[PDB]
Amino acid sequence: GYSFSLTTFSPSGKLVQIEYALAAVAGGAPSVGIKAANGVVLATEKKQKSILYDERSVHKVEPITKHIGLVYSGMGPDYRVLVHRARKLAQQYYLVYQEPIPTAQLVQRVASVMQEYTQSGGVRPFGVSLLICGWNEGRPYLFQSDPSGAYFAWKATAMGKNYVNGKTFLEKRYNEDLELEDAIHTAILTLKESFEGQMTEDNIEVGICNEAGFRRLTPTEVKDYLAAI
Template sequence: MASADGGAYSYSLTVFSPSGKLVQIEHALAAVSQGTTSLGIKASNGIVIATEKKSSSILIDDSMIEKVAVICPNIGIVYSGMGPDFRILVSRARKSAQAYWKIHNEYPPTKVLTQEIATIMQQATHSGGVRPYGVSLLVAGWDINRGPSLYQVDPSGSFWAWKASAIGKNMVNAKTFLEKRYNDDISLEDAIHTALLTLKEGFEGHMTEKTIEIGIITVPSEADLAVGKVEGTGRVKPTFRKLTEEEVRDYLAM
């Protein structure tokens, strides 16, 4: 396409193919399927999200690799696919959570923030000059209305609530494994062990605390809800946190 000044430029626009498919979204899903396996499990008293964290060289400082990210004290996410795309979505999700805080004096419910992320991803599927995000996300959170919630968001902007799900390279086998082991009464501790066993099924090499990253949602007790705020800040106590390498090592040793 020629510009007004005689120069040439081109842009990429996602359009429907004659068969009714959005080819760029299929390409984005292919990028997700090449990413490392990530999974989430909703327990009776919390949620666990976990992923493989491998570096391509022993020379890389893997302490700088972050695949499980804290969005706000009650929400965390994990991804499979393209790391740079994930970084942008994390930044925008954090800004959205802080904007919600300023207006409502509380952090957003999990579904509200998931919808915001899904909208950002959906807008990229029909905007000129951009491509769909090459990531799928698992969003774990807790709020007073819905309790613990686990959502999956795909490059199309579609999102679903799950009891357990997997994304990435080994997602088919991981989902089959989860279907056999999941039950509605599973505890958070058992969910962590199940997550590790699921990742181990398709793991290449030796699984250590350096090659696994885990985040957990804990449901606050009645006493915690009564206290409510972190002293001196006015903010709620966090329900999401990432496990330390020492904690992951202890779970692997069990």
């Protein structure tokens, strides 16, 4: 293996491989996260290239524990590695403290793992950005993590293709008094903007987090919500 760093400083002080990884991320499928008073909603677009594909073979929304969930934007193969490591870290924390890991601690550990690949020998940075949702101490959380290793706490956010317009949409139509169902309606509407084709229950994925835990909605419920809208 190569023992030298492949990421180095530019004469203007920029780390360029990180910029290229962000360029890779900005070309992925859209994702939306909204935090309400009762829980968090994550939505993503799941358009596929052909009808021969099995729509239920792989999922973008995945549970880390009983109360934490992930979505991503970027490259799928890197997302799988990150998901595996996040699950292992949560299990280690549980083994030590006999208590479920809080969201803000999992985000920190995952961010440190993502940063290790920027200052290590012979490897390239991850090309994915992550949205994490959780429920702790009777209140919800929503975090974002970048390929560089920096994380932020948001109320509503959009990522992927055409995310500036998504952020403007969320800014104009967000207030702190939303219930979870109004949040789901707003998330689906935000995904509707800049969508290609006619959307059904088979080409979007939704996940919710509240007091009972994290769960991904079944296609029947997505059909109900789409009919309502």
